[PDB]
Every structure is written in structure tokens, then in C-alpha cells.
Amino acid sequence: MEAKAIARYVRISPRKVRLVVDLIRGKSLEEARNILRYTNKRGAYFVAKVLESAAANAVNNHDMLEDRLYVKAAYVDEGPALKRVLPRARGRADIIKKRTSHITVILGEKHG
Amino acid sequence: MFAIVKTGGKQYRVEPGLKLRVEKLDAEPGATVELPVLLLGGEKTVVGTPVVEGASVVAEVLGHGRGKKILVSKFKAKVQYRRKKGHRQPYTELLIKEIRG
Amino acid sequence: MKTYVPKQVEPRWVLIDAEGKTLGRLATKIATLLRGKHRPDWTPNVAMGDFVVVVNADKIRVTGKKLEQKIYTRYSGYPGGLKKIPLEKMLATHPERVLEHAVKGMLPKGPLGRRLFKRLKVYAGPDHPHQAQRPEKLEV
Amino acid sequence: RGEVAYSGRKIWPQKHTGRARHGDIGAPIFVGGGVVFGPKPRDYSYTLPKKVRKKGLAMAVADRAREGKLLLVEAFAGVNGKTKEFLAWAKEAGLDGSESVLLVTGNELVRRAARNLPWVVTLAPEGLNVYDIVRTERLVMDLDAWEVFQNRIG
Amino acid sequence: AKHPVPKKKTSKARRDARRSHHALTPPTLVPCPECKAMKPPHTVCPECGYYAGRKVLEV
Amino acid sequence: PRAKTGVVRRRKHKKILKLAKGYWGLRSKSFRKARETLFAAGNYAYAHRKRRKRDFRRLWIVRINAACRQHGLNYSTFIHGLKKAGIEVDRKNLADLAVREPQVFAELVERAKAAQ
RNA sequence: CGUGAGGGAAAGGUGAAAAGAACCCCGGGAGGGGAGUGAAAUAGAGCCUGAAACCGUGGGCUUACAAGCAGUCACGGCCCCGGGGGUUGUGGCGUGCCUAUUGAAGCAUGAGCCGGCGACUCACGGUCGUGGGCGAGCUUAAGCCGUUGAGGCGGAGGC
RNA sequence: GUGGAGCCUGGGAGUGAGGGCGCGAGCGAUAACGUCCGCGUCCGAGCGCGGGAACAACCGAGACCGCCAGCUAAGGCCCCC
RNA sequence: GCCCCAGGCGGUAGGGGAGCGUUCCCGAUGCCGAUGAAGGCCGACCCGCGAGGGCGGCUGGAGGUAAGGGAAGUGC
Ligand SMILES: [Mg+2]
Ligand SMILES: [Mg+2]
Ligand SMILES: [Mg+2]
Ligand SMILES: [Mg+2]
Ligand SMILES: [Mg+2]
Ligand SMILES: [Mg+2]
Ligand SMILES: [Mg+2]
Ligand SMILES: [Mg+2]
Ligand SMILES: [Mg+2]
Ligand SMILES: [Mg+2]
Ligand SMILES: [Mg+2]
Ligand SMILES: [Mg+2]
Ligand SMILES: [Mg+2]
Ligand SMILES: [Mg+2]
Ligand SMILES: [Mg+2]
Ligand SMILES: [Mg+2]
Ligand SMILES: [Mg+2]
Ligand SMILES: [Mg+2]
Ligand SMILES: [Mg+2]
Ligand SMILES: [Mg+2]
Ligand SMILES: [Mg+2]
Ligand SMILES: [Mg+2]
Ligand SMILES: [Mg+2]
Ligand SMILES: [Mg+2]
Ligand SMILES: [Mg+2]
Ligand SMILES: [Mg+2]
Ligand SMILES: [Mg+2]
Ligand SMILES: [Mg+2]
Ligand SMILES: [Mg+2]
Ligand SMILES: [Mg+2]
Ligand SMILES: [Mg+2]
Ligand SMILES: [Mg+2]
Ligand SMILES: [Mg+2]
Ligand SMILES: [Mg+2]
Ligand SMILES: [Mg+2]
Ligand SMILES: [Mg+2]
Ligand SMILES: [Mg+2]
Ligand SMILES: [Mg+2]
Ligand SMILES: [Mg+2]
Ligand SMILES: [Mg+2]
Ligand SMILES: [Mg+2]
Ligand SMILES: [Mg+2]
Ligand SMILES: [Mg+2]
Ligand SMILES: [Mg+2]
Ligand SMILES: [Mg+2]
Ligand SMILES: [Mg+2]
Ligand SMILES: [Mg+2]
Ligand SMILES: [Mg+2]
Ligand SMILES: [Mg+2]
Ligand SMILES: [Mg+2]
Ligand SMILES: [Mg+2]
Ligand SMILES: [Mg+2]
Ligand SMILES: [Mg+2]
Ligand SMILES: [Mg+2]
Ligand SMILES: [Mg+2]
Ligand SMILES: [Mg+2]
Ligand SMILES: [Mg+2]
Ligand SMILES: [Mg+2]
Ligand SMILES: [Mg+2]
Ligand SMILES: [Mg+2]
Ligand SMILES: [Mg+2]
Ligand SMILES: [Mg+2]
Ligand SMILES: [Mg+2]
Ligand SMILES: [Mg+2]
Ligand SMILES: [Mg+2]
Ligand SMILES: [Mg+2]
Ligand SMILES: [Mg+2]
Ligand SMILES: [Mg+2]
Ligand SMILES: [Mg+2]
Ligand SMILES: [Mg+2]
Ligand SMILES: [Mg+2]
Ligand SMILES: [Mg+2]
Ligand SMILES: [Mg+2]
Ligand SMILES: [Mg+2]
Ligand SMILES: [Mg+2]
Ligand SMILES: [Mg+2]
Ligand SMILES: [Mg+2]
Ligand SMILES: [Mg+2]
Ligand SMILES: [Mg+2]
Ligand SMILES: [Mg+2]
Ligand SMILES: [Mg+2]
Ligand SMILES: [Mg+2]
Ligand SMILES: [Mg+2]
Ligand SMILES: [Mg+2]
Ligand SMILES: [Mg+2]
Ligand SMILES: [Mg+2]
Ligand SMILES: [Mg+2]
Ligand SMILES: [Mg+2]
Ligand SMILES: [Mg+2]
Ligand SMILES: [Mg+2]
Ligand SMILES: [Mg+2]
Ligand SMILES: [Mg+2]
Ligand SMILES: [Mg+2]
Ligand SMILES: [Mg+2]
Ligand SMILES: [Mg+2]
Ligand SMILES: [Mg+2]
Ligand SMILES: [Mg+2]
Ligand SMILES: [Mg+2]
Ligand SMILES: [Mg+2]
Ligand SMILES: [Mg+2]
Ligand SMILES: [Mg+2]
Ligand SMILES: [Mg+2]
Ligand SMILES: [Mg+2]
Ligand SMILES: [Mg+2]
Ligand SMILES: [Mg+2]
Ligand SMILES: [Mg+2]
Ligand SMILES: [Mg+2]
Ligand SMILES: [Mg+2]
Ligand SMILES: [Mg+2]
Ligand SMILES: [Mg+2]
Ligand SMILES: [Mg+2]
Ligand SMILES: [Zn+2]
Numbered sequence A: 001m002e003a004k005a006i007a008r009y010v011r012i013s014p015r016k017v018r019l020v021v022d023l024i025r026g027k028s029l030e031e032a033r034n035i036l037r038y039t040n041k042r043g044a045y046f047v048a049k050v051l052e053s054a055a056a057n058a059v060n061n062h063d064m065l066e067d068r069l070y071v072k073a074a075y076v077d078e079g080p081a082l083k084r085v086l087p088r089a090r091g092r093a094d095i096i097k098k099r100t101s102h103i104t105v106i107l108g109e110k111h112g
Numbered sequence B: 001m002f003a004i005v006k007t008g009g010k011q012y013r014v015e016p017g018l019k020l021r022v023e024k025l026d027a028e029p030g031a032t033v034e035l036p037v038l039l040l041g042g043e044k045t046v047v048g049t050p051v052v053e054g055a056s057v058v059a060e061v062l063g064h065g066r067g068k069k070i071l072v073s074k075f076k077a078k079v080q081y082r083r084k085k086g087h088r089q090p091y092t093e094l095l096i097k098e099i100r101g
Numbered sequence C: 001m002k003t004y005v006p007k008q009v010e011p012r013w014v015l016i017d018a019e020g021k022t023l024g025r026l027a028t029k030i031a032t033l034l035r036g037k038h039r040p041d042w043t044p045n046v047a048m049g050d051f052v053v054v055v056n057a058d059k060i061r062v063t064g065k066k067l068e069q070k071i072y073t074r075y076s077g078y079p080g081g082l083k084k085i086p087l088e089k090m091l092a093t094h095p096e097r098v099l100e101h102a103v104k105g106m107l108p109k110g111p112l113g114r115r116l117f118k119r120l121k122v123y124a125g126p127d128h129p130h131q132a133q134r135p136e137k138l139e140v
Numbered sequence D: 001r002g003e004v005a006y007s008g009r010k011i012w013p014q015k016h017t018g019r020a021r022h023g024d025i026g027a028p029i030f031v032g033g034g035v036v037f038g039p040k041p042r043d044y045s046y047t048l049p050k051k052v053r054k055k056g057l058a059m060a061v062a063d064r065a066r067e068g069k070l071l072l073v074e075a076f077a078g079v080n081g082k083t084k085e086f087l088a089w090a091k092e093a094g095l096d097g098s099e100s101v102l103l104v105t106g107n108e109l110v111r112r113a114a115r116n117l118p119w120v121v122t123l124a125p126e127g128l129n130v131y132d133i134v135r136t137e138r139l140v141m142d143l144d145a146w147e148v149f150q151n152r153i154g
Numbered sequence E: 001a002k003h004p005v006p007k008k009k010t011s012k013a014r015r016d017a018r019r020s021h022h023a024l025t026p027p028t029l030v031p032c033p034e035c036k037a038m039k040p041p042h043t044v045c046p047e048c049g050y051y052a053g054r055k056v057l058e059v
Numbered sequence F: 001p002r003a004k005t006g007v008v009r010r011r012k013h014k015k016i017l018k019l020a021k022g023y024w025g026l027r028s029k030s031f032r033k034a035r036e037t038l039f040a041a042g043n044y045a046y047a048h049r050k051r052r053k054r055d056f057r058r059l060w061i062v063r064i065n066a067a068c069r070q071h072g073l074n075y076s077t078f079i080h081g082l083k084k085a086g087i088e089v090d091r092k093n094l095a096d097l098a099v100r101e102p103q104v105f106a107e108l109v110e111r112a113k114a115a116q
Numbered sequence G: 001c002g003u004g005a006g007g008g009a010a011a012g013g014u015g016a017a018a019a020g021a022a023c024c025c026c027g028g029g030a031g032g033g034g035a036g037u038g039a040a041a042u043a044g045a046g047c048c049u050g051a052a053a054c055c056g057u058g059g060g061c062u063u064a065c066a067a068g069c070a071g072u073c074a075c076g077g078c079c080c081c082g083g084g085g086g087u088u089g090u091g092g093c094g095u096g097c098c099u100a101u102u103g104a105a106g107c108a109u110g111a112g113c114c115g116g117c118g119a120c121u122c123a124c125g126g127u128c129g130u131g132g133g134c135g136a137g138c139u140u141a142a143g144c145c146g147u148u149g150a151g152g153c154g155g156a157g158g159c
Numbered sequence H: 001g002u003g004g005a006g007c008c009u010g011g012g013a014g015u016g017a018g019g020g021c022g023c024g025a026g027c028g029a030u031a032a033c034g035u036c037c038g039c040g041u042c043c044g045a046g047c048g049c050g051g052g053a054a055c056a057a058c059c060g061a062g063a064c065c066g067c068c069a070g071c072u073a074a075g076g077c078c079c080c081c
Numbered sequence I: 001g002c003c004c005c006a007g008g009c010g011g012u013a014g015g016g017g018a019g020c021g022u023u024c025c026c027g028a029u030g031c032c033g034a035u036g037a038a039g040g041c042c043g044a045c046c047c048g049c050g051a052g053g054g055c056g057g058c059u060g061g062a063g064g065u066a067a068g069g070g071a072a073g074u075g076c
Helices: A014-024 A029-037 A042-061 C023-035 C087-093 C096-105 C111-118 D050-066 D083-091 D108-114 D130-135 D143-152 E012-018 F008-019 F031-069 F075-084 F091-100 F102-114
Strands: A003-010 A069-078 A082-087 A093-098 A101-109 B002-006 B011-014 B019-023 B032-035 B039-041 B057-066 B070-076 B081-087 B090-099 C012-017 C050-055 C071-075 C082-086 D070-073 D101-104 D120-123 D138-142
Touching: A003 A042, A014 A029, A014 A042, A014 A069, A014 A101, A029 A042, A029 A069, A042 A069, A042 A101, B011 B019, B011 F091, B070 F031, C012 C023, C023 C050, C023 C096, C023 C111, C050 C096, C071 C087, C082 C087, C087 C096, D050 D070, D050 D130, D050 D138, D050 D143, D070 D143, D083 D108, D101 D108, D101 D130, D108 D120, D120 D130, D138 D143, F008 F031, F031 F075, F031 F091, F031 F102, F075 F102, F091 F102
Parallel strands: C012 C050, D070 D138, D101 D120, D101 D138
Antiparallel strands: A003 A101, A069 A101, A082 A093, B002 B011, B002 B039, B019 B090, B032 B057, B057 B090, B070 B081, C071 C082
């Protein structure tokens, strides 16, 4: 059995959070929880809520044991972008892209 | 035993039981064809000069086919010259049966 | 009927005495051996030549004034880093490199011709430390 | 590009802006701009030679006759402007509904009785055209339509 | 100066190659001998407030 | 009527891009770069079919010369001998003999030496 | 947007029906996971279809002594389907595309990439070819009648 | 001499920046990858192929396609080859 | 008298020829279509010298449209 959680339209640039999600891919839920708590990244806060929601979905919804849960698969997808004007010198206006992430975490069960 | 035949402007070593594709033959499927023999090997090393005297091999015709397509394409730069041609070279499939050595 | 492609073999080891021989005309025969072109089953894309061991490199000879007029060259990459080493000075200091640099320059460029050159074992003095290989002698 | 809603103002200067050069956004190179050589109101009608028309008219029925498909009638018996009354007359005429019919008659009630039929083309005799002959399989002509027929091909 | 500028777009191959060094390291964490909770070493445990055996922090 | 592009350009680009699968970078991903790669691909293909013929002939000649020098002559004299010896076995098979059947080949070296 | 005259956008689609997801679960929320609705929920409202560039996750082959318009030809290795397909180790060979030019791989122009828009047409004449009609003749133009996608009349006039 | 010969009439053009080379001259300095004519050639349009290390026009040769067959051309045949 | 023999087939400006595809019309009150239209994705199979066409699997869920001709906002 697998259990998943998705955080969509999270207003953090994907490339940044992918750094965090890379730290937990394959880790045990316990190892992943401890990683994020002291991962000095804004991403950690978001990747954490996904992990716990995924953890919760496995226990309540999907007949899975919290002590056997590991991050089977995880990835950040790019949502739409919040395009914003950045005033530059000499009357030029840049377009800043405030990017967005679709954060997914799939938990499996480490059998043994 | 083995021999080296001539067929379709190309020489091939042949042994009995062999499947070999050569140029299209003007023969029917099922029928047999008497190929030349330029040399016999195995035991009797008979070196034709150029063909052996009266020895042949006996190839049964397995059927005819065309080769897998070849996209012959030509291109010249700065001249707008592009050619795209498809090519399926036809072939006759042979089963060698005997080596009348 | 398709052309024969040799499944691998173990390489044949060969000993050659560079005593008295001429540099280019021995480098020729080593190259051929290194390519493996003396074998009738030669394949251009595989290292299947012979392992050529040379001895008495110091004793190799050259015609004309090439002892002191032929100048080897290295470019260090820095300004004025063009080194100039006449053959005399080469044999004086690193003699085995003469035939080595002649066999290499007659080997094809590319990854294979670099491995083929690694099958070259040039030594000055009659001894070579390749006894475990059983090197045939070749009179060339 | 002239008939389009935009202004004629040159969108930006000709040189030194690093952009491609442009005039008005009405130009056909612009998304939303004018069309190049697109359709305009047009008269497709031409005066095909009157003789060719006649000969076509003559030859089209001439074809129908050759197949044994031209049929002439004296009147339409049990009909009075009711469709089933035409089904009667047609069935007893050899017209079953397996063949299309260009029914050419000046009888207003007979055209009225037969026109809603899918396999029938109502026609007045003055209407005999060659496209409608070819359209259908069967030609069925009240002799008065045959009257005005010959007097037009003459 | 005269406004240097990228001559060619960087391939996906060479961009990600530049990022072959951007992976984060996991934080160094050791179990707290009191409450057995994982914490960065040489920090006062923010769970039980104990550092060096003694109670430092009122958590 | 208006005949918009519709599906036509997408289907054209896909056929090229499919023929461009396996290519490095945009050469398989960008239609424009795929077309340029496929232009040289087809010219190489054709020019190499003409050249593959020379390449295997070069391979047979060397293999023959190597078997011929095993028997005291060279390729050039071996071919002159066969010429006069009336033997017309092609190099694709002379070289195949030299590997698989070196006794039939030794026979051919004999016939060649004798023809001159 | 412009002081103003004036310029001047973008932006359509759930489903048959809101039946538009009660309740519960993680979460401050957003979002998600169960449940439920529905023929369909990668029809879930950021809604039909959902290409391409573009960004990821996973798997196969491959790669850290190697020289390259990126391909191609050959052999070989590995993986896959039951001779193919995928991958590329070595060997050979190999000067992007377009434009403009006497001559460009050219260190001469254009192009970041992708998708869609994007350029020889129409009218009336003229000229020649042509497919038919009629032929020392051929043809009507307005308009008139009819039809409501029916054609016919009309000889003024033209050649 | 039956040839993608020619002639006659029409329809459609494009081109009217050429360039290198050999030869014959002018100009130039018995200079220029010079310039200007003439004859020829190739490139242009054969930046397709073999040679000339590489290289439009020098040498060889006019690429319908396919072959893991054969003879040659220039050039080559000690090794790269 | 569909086969056989021989010959030609480098090409820019350009001339001519033969085809493919796109939108729309006649065919069509027809035919195909919820046992799945158009479109999309994939295919190493089939037909074609090629532009292409078919067939098969998947997606799609409501349109499409032959033979044979016609007309163009027709192919980047
Ligand atoms: Mg972060
Ligand atoms: Mg839990
Ligand atoms: Mg300002
Ligand atoms: Mg940007
Ligand atoms: Mg950005
Ligand atoms: Mg951002
Ligand atoms: Mg074959
Ligand atoms: Mg054949
Ligand atoms: Mg080009
Ligand atoms: Mg080129
Ligand atoms: Mg050119
Ligand atoms: Mg071109
Ligand atoms: Mg052209
Ligand atoms: Mg100096
Ligand atoms: Mg305008
Ligand atoms: Mg205007
Ligand atoms: Mg306006
Ligand atoms: Mg206007
Ligand atoms: Mg103005
Ligand atoms: Mg710019
Ligand atoms: Mg404009
Ligand atoms: Mg408009
Ligand atoms: Mg007209
Ligand atoms: Mg008119
Ligand atoms: Mg009707
Ligand atoms: Mg300054
Ligand atoms: Mg860049
Ligand atoms: Mg990558
Ligand atoms: Mg990556
Ligand atoms: Mg278009
Ligand atoms: Mg050849
Ligand atoms: Mg053997
Ligand atoms: Mg304002
Ligand atoms: Mg204002
Ligand atoms: Mg609706
Ligand atoms: Mg709550
Ligand atoms: Mg909620
Ligand atoms: Mg939900
Ligand atoms: Mg249900
Ligand atoms: Mg259903
Ligand atoms: Mg369905
Ligand atoms: Mg759901
Ligand atoms: Mg779907
Ligand atoms: Mg759907
Ligand atoms: Mg939302
Ligand atoms: Mg939408
Ligand atoms: Mg719908
Ligand atoms: Mg989508
Ligand atoms: Mg996509
Ligand atoms: Mg990957
Ligand atoms: Mg090295
Ligand atoms: Mg290596
Ligand atoms: Mg490499
Ligand atoms: Mg290669
Ligand atoms: Mg220019
Ligand atoms: Mg210029
Ligand atoms: Mg450049
Ligand atoms: Mg410039
Ligand atoms: Mg430039
Ligand atoms: Mg450029
Ligand atoms: Mg210019
Ligand atoms: Mg350009
Ligand atoms: Mg730009
Ligand atoms: Mg485009
Ligand atoms: Mg025109
Ligand atoms: Mg016109
Ligand atoms: Mg005209
Ligand atoms: Mg005319
Ligand atoms: Mg007549
Ligand atoms: Mg008249
Ligand atoms: Mg001519
Ligand atoms: Mg003319
Ligand atoms: Mg001109
Ligand atoms: Mg002029
Ligand atoms: Mg001039
Ligand atoms: Mg001039
Ligand atoms: Mg000229
Ligand atoms: Mg001139
Ligand atoms: Mg000049
Ligand atoms: Mg000239
Ligand atoms: Mg001379
Ligand atoms: Mg002088
Ligand atoms: Mg001169
Ligand atoms: Mg030109
Ligand atoms: Mg020419
Ligand atoms: Mg040339
Ligand atoms: Mg020429
Ligand atoms: Mg050359
Ligand atoms: Mg050049
Ligand atoms: Mg050349
Ligand atoms: Mg030719
Ligand atoms: Mg010969
Ligand atoms: Mg010669
Ligand atoms: Mg040479
Ligand atoms: Mg050699
Ligand atoms: Mg020609
Ligand atoms: Mg041609
Ligand atoms: Mg068409
Ligand atoms: Mg439409
Ligand atoms: Mg209809
Ligand atoms: Mg109906
Ligand atoms: Mg189906
Ligand atoms: Mg359509
Ligand atoms: Mg297809
Ligand atoms: Mg068709
Ligand atoms: Mg399908
Ligand atoms: Mg479909
Ligand atoms: Mg269709
Ligand atoms: Mg239709
Ligand atoms: Mg257009
Ligand atoms: Mg197109
Ligand atoms: Zn503690």
C-alpha cells in the first residue's frame, strides 16, 4: 500500500523546495521528520506539512503503520507563476516571476 | 562441405541448409536454381579458374521480398535543394540444398 | 554472408632487439605489430595487436646527421616554453623515448591508438621485466 | 489593413528601439490586423452560352430517357393536393420510393401533394434545369411540362 | 565597462552540471541523552531543556 | 472559406521530430534543430553507403595482405597471380577464406605463385 | 495609456443534471487524503479536448585520459520484445540552417525555444494557351418574367 | 554527323554585381587574390564525389537508387593511410 | 504486341509536368458514429519514390463525411 499527500499552489519557488524534498526522498518518516525540524530552509515548513498530511493519510485513511512509513517517492512540480512588475531604472519595468510549487510526498511501508 | 557461388554480381560462401538473401532472381517460389561455383571446400579443395568445371550448388527459392525501407535523402545548403526518396531494394531468398561437387 | 568479427583472444607477446637497427624502419614494423595488421583477422576498432617489447633502445641508430640535427620539441603552454631537445641529448638522458616517440607518432590518433601505444614496452639494455609473459623473439 | 479598426499611428519609431520596424497594428503581419487578399463580396454568376444551356437541358432528359427512366403522364389520377393521394398515384405508377424523382408538372396541387416527399423533387415546367435532372434517378413529366420542354429546346 | 552578456543560452546539460554542487546536506543531529530526542549537537535541547546533564532551559 | 493551419503543421513537425529521436539536446526536442540535424543525417547516410563499400574493401585487403605475408608474398603480387591464375574469387571471400579456411587459402597462394 | 485630441487590450466552454463533494482525517489557511455524487472527477470548478516548448519523479543503456555542426557507417557490449527496438564503447567519415554573394562553417544577415497569425489575390480589361458550344456567323447588357438556391425572356449593343 | 541537334511560330522566364585558372594584349611597376578586353575553361549552378594535408573554380571525374562484388582515373603503394 | 531492348535522369535564377495535404460546396432527407466522430498520444506493421494514406492500441465524448467533381483566407 502507498499513501500520498499533495500541497498545490504553495507560493515558494520549486527549485528551492526541491533542495529540501531531496533531503527526505527515501528517508524513514522518523528520519525525515528530524531532518526537516532542523533543515535551515523556508522549504522545510512546507515539505513538513506535506509529510505529516501524508503520514496522517496512511494511518487514518489507508491502514498503514506510522512506524513502517518511509518516503517512497517525492517531488516538487511547478505550478503557475505569480507575475509581478519590478520597476527598474530609466522607465524599464521587469517582470518578476514569483513562482509556485506542487509538493507531493508518497509514503510506502518498509516491510520487515 | 562448402562452396563459393556467384549470384547478382556478388560472391558468397555457401553450405547446405543455409538461408541467404541475394539479388532478385527470375525464378518462381518453390523452384530451384543452379548457381555457378567458383570454389569448393570442406574436403575436396577444388579451385575453379574462374568457375569449376561442372559442379554447381542447388538453391531452392524461398520467395521474394523487398528490403526494409532506406530513406535516401539529398540536401544542398544555401540552394534550397532537398530530396527525399524511399528505397526498398528487392531480394530473392534462397535455401541451398546440395553442392554438386 | 557477413564479414568475420573475431571474438577476443589473449594478446601475443613479442620481443624485438633494437640493436643496430634504423629508427624509422623499426618504428614501422612495431606499429604494424601494434595495430595487429600482421594478423589476417585484423579489426580496425579493437585492440588485438601484439604486445611489442623492445630492448637495447639505447643501441638504435640513425642515418645522416640526425644524431645532433634532429630536434625534438615540447610546448609547455607558457610564453617561450618551446623546448628543443636534439636527438643526441635525448638518447643521452632518456634514450627509450626516441623509439617510443617514433612508434607513437606512427600510431593512429584517437582512443585506440593511445591504448595501442600502451602495448609498447621500450627498454634500453638487453633486459626487460616481462618474463611472466613468454615473449617470442622476432627477427625484424 | 485599411478596413480594420485600428489607428494609423506608427507604433514605435523606425530605428533605435531594438524592435522590428512597424507602422500601424492594422498591418496584416499583426495578430488582429488586416487580411491579405482574403475573400470579398463576389459575384460567381456568369452567362453560360444559352445554346449550351439548351443542349444540356436536351441531353439531360435525353440521358434519363436512354436508361428507361423518363416517364410521361397524362394526369395524376386520385390526387387533389394530399400526400397520401400521391403515394397512391405513384405506387400505381411504378414509383415506389426506391428511386429519386424529378416530378415536373404545372399542376399546383400535384407539386403540393408530392413535395414533402424525401425522394421527390417538385418542379414547375418552366423550372426544368439540368442539375435537377441529374440529381434524381427518375424523371416524371406531365405532358404539358413535356410541352414547354420541347418548345424551349427548339 | 560595456555590458557583458551571455553569448549562448546554457544547455540543460550545462546548467544542471553547474548545480552538481547545490544538493543540501542533512543537518547533523545527535540523540539527547535525556529525552533521546534528535537535536543539533552542542545546542541546548529544545525539548527537555537539558544541556551538559543539567537543566538549562525551562521548556 | 478559411483554411486555417489546423493540425497540419503539428503533424509535420512530429514526423520530423520522430525521425530525430535520440538526438542530443534540442536536436531531438526543437523542430528547427531536428530538421537541421536530419539534413546532415541523410547526407551522411547516403555518402556513407557509398563509403561503406570502400571501407569493407579496405578491411578485406588488409586481412588478405596479412595472410599473404604469412606465405612469403604481398597482397599486390597475390592479386596479380590470381589475375593470371584465372581465379576470380572476390576479396569479401578471399578474406573470409584467409580466416576460416586458410588451407584453401594456402592453395590459392600456391596457384598465385605458379601463375607467374 | 495620454494634459488633451486621441489611442486602446486581454478575457468564451464542468456536467445530461450542481448531483458543485455532507461527514471524517492532516493542516492556521491553501492544499490534500478518505467518504460521497456522477457514465466519466487526470469532467472538481486553477473545471471539455489538453499538442509543443518548459520543469520534475521513477526505470533501461551510457559516461569522469576525453577533441565535439553532435551526425552518420561498421562492429561490439549491455537492456527490452518474441530477427527487431532502445542505448553507445571503439573505428571510419563529416565545415549547422537561412539570407546575401564572385566566394560563408564562416569571425557577413536573421533566428532563445515552442505554439498559433503570417506573404503572388480579386475586379475589370488585354494577350496567349486550352475545354466545350455554335459557326459566316457568335453573343447579348441593362432590365423584364418566373423560381425562392428553376430558370427563361430580353439583339440595345460587341466582336 | 538523328542530336535534350537545328529551324519556324507563339507562351513563360530569369539574367543584364561574376569570379578563378590557362593562353593573347592594354593599363599597372615584364606589382596585386590588381584592373580592362579577347579565346577557352571550370566555379557560379558540380561548397556533390577522388587527389592535392586542409582549400569554389589546380589534377581526376559529371552523383537516379541499392550491394559487405569487379576494373580503373588523378594521385599514390615505409607508418599515420 | 501488359512485357522486352536500349538510352537519358548534378543542378541555382527560371520554364514545364505530375501528385499529396488543408477549409468549404455538390454527392447528402444519404452514409459513418455512444459497440465511441473530430482531435490528441503511440506503433519497430501495411500501401506510396515522396508530400502522404491506412491499420492497430490508448486518450477523447459528438461529431465526421466516400467514390467523383467544384471553390479557396490552402501547407511557415
Ligand atoms: Mg527552501
Ligand atoms: Mg501520524
Ligand atoms: Mg520615472
Ligand atoms: Mg525571463
Ligand atoms: Mg525564474
Ligand atoms: Mg520565484
Ligand atoms: Mg540484399
Ligand atoms: Mg534484388
Ligand atoms: Mg546553410
Ligand atoms: Mg555545407
Ligand atoms: Mg551558393
Ligand atoms: Mg536547401
Ligand atoms: Mg531552387
Ligand atoms: Mg621564438
Ligand atoms: Mg493599415
Ligand atoms: Mg488606417
Ligand atoms: Mg478604433
Ligand atoms: Mg482604421
Ligand atoms: Mg499618419
Ligand atoms: Mg534583439
Ligand atoms: Mg505595421
Ligand atoms: Mg480581425
Ligand atoms: Mg473569374
Ligand atoms: Mg455576370
Ligand atoms: Mg422533396
Ligand atoms: Mg563607468
Ligand atoms: Mg546561457
Ligand atoms: Mg537532467
Ligand atoms: Mg536533474
Ligand atoms: Mg497559415
Ligand atoms: Mg568503388
Ligand atoms: Mg578461426
Ligand atoms: Mg496617469
Ligand atoms: Mg494622468
Ligand atoms: Mg452546457
Ligand atoms: Mg482544523
Ligand atoms: Mg478542506
Ligand atoms: Mg477533498
Ligand atoms: Mg457509483
Ligand atoms: Mg455509456
Ligand atoms: Mg469513456
Ligand atoms: Mg479525487
Ligand atoms: Mg483524461
Ligand atoms: Mg474528461
Ligand atoms: Mg484555490
Ligand atoms: Mg481552460
Ligand atoms: Mg461537450
Ligand atoms: Mg493539464
Ligand atoms: Mg506535456
Ligand atoms: Mg533521471
Ligand atoms: Mg595520455
Ligand atoms: Mg575511460
Ligand atoms: Mg566522448
Ligand atoms: Mg562516430
Ligand atoms: Mg547582404
Ligand atoms: Mg556583400
Ligand atoms: Mg559562429
Ligand atoms: Mg557585421
Ligand atoms: Mg556573425
Ligand atoms: Mg552567423
Ligand atoms: Mg548587408
Ligand atoms: Mg536571414
Ligand atoms: Mg529578443
Ligand atoms: Mg511556428
Ligand atoms: Mg499571379
Ligand atoms: Mg484577376
Ligand atoms: Mg486570361
Ligand atoms: Mg479563350
Ligand atoms: Mg462545330
Ligand atoms: Mg445567338
Ligand atoms: Mg537544350
Ligand atoms: Mg521563346
Ligand atoms: Mg536583372
Ligand atoms: Mg546594369
Ligand atoms: Mg555589368
Ligand atoms: Mg567589372
Ligand atoms: Mg562567364
Ligand atoms: Mg568581364
Ligand atoms: Mg577580381
Ligand atoms: Mg572567365
Ligand atoms: Mg602551360
Ligand atoms: Mg619586371
Ligand atoms: Mg594575373
Ligand atoms: Mg549568384
Ligand atoms: Mg556549371
Ligand atoms: Mg568542386
Ligand atoms: Mg558544369
Ligand atoms: Mg580533398
Ligand atoms: Mg571552402
Ligand atoms: Mg577538392
Ligand atoms: Mg550526372
Ligand atoms: Mg586489379
Ligand atoms: Mg597512374
Ligand atoms: Mg602521399
Ligand atoms: Mg599498410
Ligand atoms: Mg542535365
Ligand atoms: Mg534534375
Ligand atoms: Mg486536393
Ligand atoms: Mg469553418
Ligand atoms: Mg445536405
Ligand atoms: Mg429527415
Ligand atoms: Mg476502435
Ligand atoms: Mg474539420
Ligand atoms: Mg502516419
Ligand atoms: Mg484521398
Ligand atoms: Mg486511432
Ligand atoms: Mg481516435
Ligand atoms: Mg476527417
Ligand atoms: Mg462533407
Ligand atoms: Mg494567406
Ligand atoms: Mg507546412
Ligand atoms: Zn532532551
